[PDB]
Symmetry: D3
Subunit: 257 residues, 6 copies
C-alpha cells in the first residue's frame, strides 16, 4: 500500500492513526532557482523522495509537501532576486505549519516528522511548531511530539563527506545547487539535470556579514554557490542510503513502536 | 519541454517570462468517501492545467496542496479524519505571496484554477491584497483570471450526456459522479468503485449549524453517489473542461 | 419591551441570559442601483431579525454595518462609489470578538443572519475561530446557526409569484425584484421605482477577472431589473422568511 | 435630502463627492450604562450630533461603528459587566483603516471621526495612521482627517457650572452620569428611566490600574457618577453647544 | 545585590521566583526639546523602578526602549526627527509575549511602569490578551498593576511646592518642568538648561488633525517651558513617586 | 560627544543625519551559573559603542528581548529567566524601527546581532521594511546585518583563543567566548568559580519538541568557560571592533 496520505481513503488513514503510534512525515521544500543545470523544485523532490523511502522502511505515512518556502538568502541560496524563485513571507510559512499540526492533532495523530529540504525554512518551521504546541497545550494536549530536521544534516560520516568533497567540506550553506543536490537528482530524477550545463566556478565566499537590498553582483552569476561538475549517480545513491538509514534509525529511536 | 515551472531551470523560466500565462492549481487534502483517495482536489485541477497549458503554451506553478476548511453542505464537514485544512488567513496569505513573487519575476498574467469548493473567497481576498500592493508600486497591468474548473461543464448537451438522470448541483458533487469519473479516466488506481456507498443525494435545510453535526452528513463523507461513474464520463468532462478553459484563457490573455 | 439588546439596560440583558437566543444581522454598505439606497443589506436582515425575535422571544444585537468586498458576479463590483467594504480579516475578527463576548455574558445561542452575498465565508471563519478559542476554555456548549435570509424562500409557488420569467439565482438578484420588493414593503421612502433601469439579467462566463472590469457589469450596478417589484411581493417575501426562520430557530434552539 | 450616506443611492453619493464633501463617521460601542439607561448610548449620541452638524454644514454621515474597544474600569466600569460587547484593539483599528481606504477610493478627502466611547481614541488614531500610511504609498497626501470626542467641545464655564455645580468631575468618571443622561433625556427619553438612577458619590480610584479588573472597585450600578440631576433642559444646552462648536471647527478645518 | 533581572544568573532569578514582584519600565525614544536627550522616557521610569525595587525587594526587567507614536497634543507629534515609534500591534505584542514568558517562569505579580504618555492603551491591550491566554491554560492568579509614574504626584501640598505658579497638566508636561527637573536630579549631564526655549504653555482646540500639522506645535518640540526646572524639584518628585508607588505595590502585592 | 542616539537632543540627531546608524539586537537569556542574563545585549552594545567612536557612527537603543532560545544553541526556552518574543513580534519591531529611521532621512543601518536565535527574524523585518520603502520608490536605504562573533575567524586568532580547537559558535553559549568578553568588559557580572566544567554539548542531527530538558547540560551552558580569561576577552574585543569598523567603512564610505 502507498505510504502517501494523499493516496489513502479517509477510512484507511483513520485506521492507521487508530492503530496508535502512527508516524506522520511532512516534506518542507521550496520553488527556488538551482543554477543552469537543474530544475527549480529540487527542494521538494529530494526531501519527499527521502521521506517516501524512510516511510517504507519504518511503516510511516507521508503528507503532501509544502511547495513554497521562505525567501532565498544570498549566502545560502543566491538571493531572492533571481527569476523563478517564488518565496513566502515568514508569517505565511509559520502559519501553514501551525495549521497542519493543529489538524493532525485533531485527527488523533501525535507523532510528526518535519523534513526540511530548503536551507531558509528552519526557523519558521520551528516557530510554527512552537505556536501549534502552545495551542495544543491550551486544549489540554501535551503528548504531541515533533521531530524536525534538514535531511543533509544526517550526512555526517567523514568517509562519506570525503567521497563527496575530497578537497574539503565547505558547509551546507554554500552547497546550493552543488555536488550534494545534483548527485541526488542524478540518482533520482536524471531527466531534470543536465550536467553539461553546469558552470564550474570556484566555491562562493562571503565576508562575515549580510547586505540588503540583496546585491546581485556578490552571487555567482549562475545562481549556484558551488560547482556540481563532480556530481554523479553513484554519489547520489550513497547520499540517499546514508540519509534514509540515518533518518529511519532516528525516527525509530524517537518514536518507538 | 515541460509545462511545469518546477521542472524548468531559472534561465528557461526567465526566457519564457509579461506575455507568458502562468497557471496555479489550488486544491486540498480532504476526505472523498470510501472509494477514493484524499488528494483528488489537487490531482484534478493539476491535470486540467497541464493539458490546457500544453495546448496554449502556458506554464503551471506547483499547486497549493492544502485548502480551506471543509463545509458540511458541500464537503461533508471538517470533522472527518484525513481532511487537513488551513485557516482562511493562511490560504489568503499564500496566494498573496505567490502573486507578489510572480509579479517580481515580470509575469503579468495568472490563472488560478480552483479544485476545492471551499477555497474561492480566500483566493479572491489573496488576489485583492496582492493587487493592492502592486498598486502601491504603480503597477496595474497584472491581470488575474480565477475559476473552479467544474463551472466549464455547462453545455446542456454535455450535462445531459453526463447526467441522463439529471444534474444534482456542484455543491453536492463531492466524491460523486463528476470527480469519480474524472479519476477513473486519469488515475483509476486511486479509485475502487466497488467501495462506493450508493446513498441518495444529500439535502440540507436553508441554514448552517456550528459546531458541525456529523449526523447530518452521509456516513461515507460523500454528498452524492458515484455508482454510475465511468471512465467515459471522465474523458468527456476532461475534454470539455480543457477546451473551454483553453478558449477562455486565449480570450482573456491573447498571445 | 424591545427585542433589541442596545435598547436594554445591562440588568435587563443580564436577566434575559440568566433565564436565550441572540440574533446578529450582518450587512454591508453597498451600491444598489439608481433606484435604491446603499444600506439595504443591513436594513433587510435587521427587519427580519426583529420580526423573528418578536415571535420566538429572542434578542437582536446591533448589526454589522460593513461587510466583505462586493464581487462583480453578485454585486456589480467593489469599484463602485459608495460601496464601503472591509478586508476579510477585519470582518472575521469582528465576528470572532462578538462571539467571545457573548460567551462571556453566558450566552450560548447565536443566530447570525447574513444580508450581504459576500459575507458568508468570512462569517464562517469568524465562527470557527471563536469556537476554537471557547474550546481552549473548556466551553463546548455554544451553538451557532448561520443563514442568509433569502435561502428560506424556496416554495415554487412563491418563486413563480416573484419571478414569473424564471428564478435568476440569488447571485444575480442584486438590486432586483426580491430586495426592491422587500424595501417597498418596509422602507418605501428609500426606493424610487421610476429610476429603475430595466436591463436584461446580467450574465457572465464561467470565470472571474481581476482587477474588476467595470464594463463586464450593467452600468446601473444592478444585476437584474426591479421593474416588477411591489409592496405586495415584499409582504409575501417577508412572511415566508419570518415564518421559515422562526420555525428553524425554534427547532435548533428549543425552549 | 438625507445627510446619511446609507440612505443615498450610489449616484447621489458620487455626485456629492464630485473631494470637496465632508464625511462624518460616528464611533461608539455597546456598553453598560447603569440601571437607568440603555446600552447603545455611545452610538446614539455621537450619531445624533453628527446628524445635526451635517445638516448645518452640508456634510454626509457614514453608518456608525456599533462596537468599540474594551470598557476600562476608571472610565467605564470595566469590561466584566454583562451586555458590554467589546472588540480587540486590532479589530477596531482595522475597521477604521478599511473604511478610510474605501472612502479615499471613492475620491473623498475629508473625514471627521466622531468618537462617543471613551476607550476608542487610541485605536482610532492608529487606524488613521495606518490608512494614511497606505495612501502615501500611492502618492496620496491630500486626505485630511479630524478626530474628536464630542464632549470635549463642552468647555463653557457657564454650561459646565449648571451640569457640575460642585465642580467638573472629568470626562472619564462622567460615564452614565449627568452629561450623557441629560443628552438622552433630550433625544431619546423612552430609553431612560431616571427613577432607576442610583445616586452614589462620584467614583474615585488610586493612581494606577489593576488587571484582572476587580469588580469591587466599581460602583455596583456600573455608573461612575450619578445622573440624578440630569434633565431634558441640560441635554438641550449640551446639544446646542456641541453642534455649534463642532460645526464651527469643521468649517474652519474643511473650508468650502 | 542587584535588583535588575538582567544582572542576575538564571539560578538567582529562579530562587527569587510566584511571591516575587516583577517591574517592567515602558518608555520610548522621543524628541524632548533642544535642552534634553531623547531617551528620557526610558531613563526616568527605570530610575523609579530601581529605587522602588530596592525598598520593597522587587526585581526589574529590561525596559521597553521604543513606544507608541508621539501625538501632537501631548508629545509634539511623530513628525519630529529622532522619535522612533512602534505600531500599536508591535507594542501590544511585546507586552503580551513578556507576560506569557514571566508566567512560564512561575511569576504571578507584575508592575508595568509607563513613562511615555502614548503607551497606555497598547500596554492595556497587551495585558488583556496575555491574561486571556493564561486563562486558556487554566491560570487565573497572575495579577498586573499598570501605572504612569507621574500620576503619583498628586498631593496638593506637593504640586503647590513644585508649581507655585500653577499646575499645567500632564498632557503638556513634555520636556517641561517635571521631566527636566527629574533629569537634573538623576542625569544632569544629559540636560542643558541654557538651551531651553521659554515659550508659553502649548494649547490646542478640542480636536485632533491628521496628517499632523507641525505648525500647531511649538518649534522646539516641548509643550511647556522647563526654564524654572531645578534639581531640588526633581529630588522632591523622585521621593514622592518612589514612596507612593512603593506603598501602592505593597498594598496590591502584600508579602 | 556621545555616540548614543538616546543621549542626543533631536536637533543634534537631525544635524548628524552619510550618517551610519547602528542597532544592537540582543536577548534576556540564561547564561549558566556563572554569568548574568543580559549578556547578549551588553556585548553587541559594547562593540557598537567602540566601533561607533572609531568610525563616527551613532548607536540606537538596543533590542532587549530576542527570539526563543533553541536547545542546540542556547539550551532551550524552558529555562527560568529567559524571556523570549514570538517571531512576528521581533520581526515587527525591526520593521517599525527601519520605517522610522527612513522617515528621519537615514539610509545607512548596521544591525548587530548578539543572540544566536535572532537572525532570520531580523532578516524578515528588514525585508518587510525595504518592501514598504520600495512602494515609495526608495531604494537607497542600505542595511548591513551581522553577528559580531562571525568576525573572529583569523586562524591565528582562533589558535590563540582555542589552542586545543574551536568548538563552533552554536555551542559557544556561556562558554569561553562570551565569558572572556564579559571578564574584560563587565567582570562584576561574572564569577568563574561558579562555572560548571562539563564536556562540550553534543546533539543528534535533529530537534525535538516539546524541548526535552534532559538533553541539555544542567547548567544551561553548552561549553565550559573554565579557560575563559580577561586576556582572551581583550583580544576578541579588538578583533571584532577592528574588523567591523573596516567592514562598515567598506560598505558605507564617505
Ligand atoms: C542546503 N542548501 C540547499 C538549498 O536550500 O537549496 C543550501 N542552499 N545551502
Ligand atoms: C465540487 N466539490 C469538490 C470538492 O470541493 O472537494 C464539492 N465538494 N462540492
Ligand atoms: C443576494 N444579493 C444581495 C446583495 O448582497 O446585495 C446578491 N447581490 N446576490
Ligand atoms: C507625560 N509626558 C511625557 C512624555 O510622554 O514624553 C507628556 N509628554 N505629556
Ligand atoms: C554564540 N551564542 C550566543 C548566544 O545566543 O548566547 C550561542 N548561543 N551559541
Ligand atoms: Zn536546494
Ligand atoms: Zn473534491
Ligand atoms: Zn443587497
Ligand atoms: Zn457612554
Ligand atoms: Zn518624556
Ligand atoms: Zn549569549
Amino acid at each position: 500500500k502507498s505510504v502517501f496520505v494523499g493516496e489513502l481513503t479517509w477510512k484507511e488513514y483513520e485506521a492507521r492513526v487508530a492503530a496508535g503510534d502512527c508516524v506522520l512525515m511532512l516534506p518542507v521544500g521550496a520553488l527556488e532557482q538551482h543554477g543552469h543545470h537543474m530544475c527549480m523544485n529540487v527542494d521538494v523532490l529530494l526531501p519527499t523522495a527521502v521521506c517516501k523511502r524512510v516511510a517504507e522502511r519504518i511503516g510511516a505515512l507521508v503528507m503532501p509537501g509544502l511547495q513554497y518556502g521562505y525567501k532565498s538568502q544570498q549566502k545560502s541560496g543566491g538571493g531572492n532576486h533571481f527569476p523563478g524563485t517564488t518565496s513566502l513571507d515568514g508569517a505565511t510559512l509559520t502559519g501553514t505549519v501551525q495549521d497542519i499540526i493543529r489538524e493532525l492533532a485533531r485527527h488523533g495523530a501525535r507523532r510528526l516528522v518535519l523534513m526540511n529540504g530548503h536551507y531558509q525554512n528552519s526557523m519558521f518551521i520551528v516557530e510554527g511548531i512552537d505556536l501549534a504546541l502552545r495551542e495544543l497545550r491550551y486544549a489540554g494536549i501535551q503528548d504531541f511530539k515533533v521531530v524536525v530536521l534538514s535531511y543533509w544534516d544526517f550526512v555526517k560520516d567523514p568517509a562519506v563527506i570525503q567521497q563527496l568533497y575530497p578537497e574539503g567540506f565547505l558547509g551546507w550553506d554554500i552547497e546550493h545547487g552543488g555536488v550534494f543536490e545534483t548527485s541526488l537528482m542524478l540518482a533520482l530524477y536524471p531527466d531534470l539535470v543536465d550536467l553539461d550545463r553546469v558552470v564550474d566556478h570556484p566555491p562562493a565566499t562571503f565576508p562575515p556579514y549580510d547586505v540588503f537590498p540583496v546585491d546581485p553582483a556578490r552571487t555567482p552569476a549562475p545562481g549556484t554557490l558551488s560547482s556540481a561538475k563532480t556530481a554523479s549517480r553513484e554519489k547520489g545513491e550513497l547520499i540517499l542510503e546514508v540519509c534514509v538509514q540515518g533518518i529511519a534509525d532516528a525516527i525509530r529511536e524517537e518514536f518507538p513502536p
